[PDB]
Symmetry: D2
Subunit: 67 residues, 4 copies
């Protein structure tokens, strides 16, 4: 239970900094591109689940790293 | 969509070494415990979705790290 | 050894977002504190080695995560 | 100070499961290859500093993942 709460806040923190990185580097299209090829319907990238958000973020970091 | 299948193969690899780490240090109970608390019904840890598998793996590693 | 330039790019990217996270959440003191205890003399957090920077970053994320 | 201890144990745990992954998938040559290309001299992969151990581990996982 307490574990479920602690991990919830850890998860929330990770989601926020991933969302922050995607915005600051204008890579939000990665989220939509990946969402479009999975069936998820989102208005904001905040509505993206981890299965979409995390790959988007990693691609984003790679694109910035190798520019 | 090639990115999807690439991340599909990365997801599989990560699940495999998490599961491997959990067995080798006999921490499978972490998975079941977390599965039960979240209303998930599994007979073996390979059936656990990442939302319980990943926290269980993390608990496992800290348990070993601070034993 | 092209792998090494490539990993150097990824190292730089990771340093940059760790540093950005630390500044944007006003957690730079973590770096200086960890530096002082390790006999490392730095004037700014961009000079902290990863052995200092990474633990400060993680400490920083947990502090923000748990309020 | 308690941090220097806790992060030491985390570090040790992480080095151990990386070394275990490299051995179980017979990817030790990744470590020697990268170490030789950095002017470092090791007999065991256990003597590899994180700066060669970590990217060697990552290459190893990718090779297994995409094999």
């Amino acid at each position: 239970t307490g574990y479920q709460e602690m991990f919830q806040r850890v998860n929330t923190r990770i989601r926020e900094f991933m969302i922050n990185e995607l915005k600051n580097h204008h890579n939000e299209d990665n989220v939509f591109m990946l969402a479009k090829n999975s069936g998820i319907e989102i208005a904001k990238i905040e509505e993206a689940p981890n299965a979409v958000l995390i790959p988007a973020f990693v691609l984003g970091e790679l694109e910035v790293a190798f520019k």
